[PDB]
């Protein structure tokens, strides 16, 4: 099993969510975060202006899925989140050591 983190433009959240539901994902956690970096019209992190602000609101999606559906998840996220413009974001994949269901105390095989 793997944890997939995706930092996307907020307006694409519903499309990504709909598409991920189609592939069979049953749970997703979403965090609102501030992104600093790649932005149209700018060339730098830290402009350090007095009244201007350098951040852009972003949405971080986290799903934990079986190894075999990782590529299907990655492919569907890119397809539904990509605009071809600056700031589309990135997908990071991480190995998970254990996955425990709180309701029953039962573990999922973290190697699937």
Q: Which of 49, 51, 52, 103 binds a second copy (CB under 8 A)?
A: 103
CA-to-CA distance for 61 and 58, rounded, in angstroms? 10
| Cα-based torsion angle of the residue sequence 7, 22, 75, 65 in order, rounded to the nearest 10 degrees | 70
Q: Tell the smallest beta-carbon distance from residue 47 to a second copy (Å).
A: 10
Residue closer to a second copy (CB basis): 21 or 111: 21
H or E element in which residue 56 lies: strand 56-65
Q: Which of 10, 45, 111, 112 binds a second copy (CB under 8 A)?
A: 45
Query: What residues contact 34, with CB distance under 8 A and at least 6 apart?
Result: 55, 56, 57, 58
Q: Which of 10, 68, 94, 111 binds a second copy (CB under 8 A)?
A: 94
CA-to-CA distance for 94 and 12, rounded, in angstroms? 23
Q: Which of 49, 53, 97, 109 binds a second copy (CB under 8 A)?
A: 97
Q: How many residues can be counted in the chain?
A: 112
Q: Which residues bind a second copy (CB under 8 A)?
A: 2-3, 6-8, 14, 17-18, 20-21, 25-31, 33-38, 44-46, 48, 55, 58, 60, 64, 74, 77-78, 81-86, 88-103, 105
């Amino acid at each position: 099993m793997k944890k997939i983190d995706a930092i996307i433009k907020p307006f694409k959240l519903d499309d990504v969510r709909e598409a991920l539901a189609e592939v069979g994902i049953t749970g997703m956690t979403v965090t609102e975060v501030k992104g600093f970096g790649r932005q149209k019209g700018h060339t730098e992190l830290y402009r350090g202006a007095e009244y201007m602000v350098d951040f852009l609101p972003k949405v971080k999606i986290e799903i934990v899925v079986p190894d075999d559906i990782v590529d299907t998840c990655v492919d569907t996220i890119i397809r539904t989140a990509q605009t071809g413009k600056i700031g589309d974001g990135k997908i990071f994949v991480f190995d998970v050591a254990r996955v425990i269901r709180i309701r029953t105390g039962e573990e999922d095989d973290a190697a699937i």
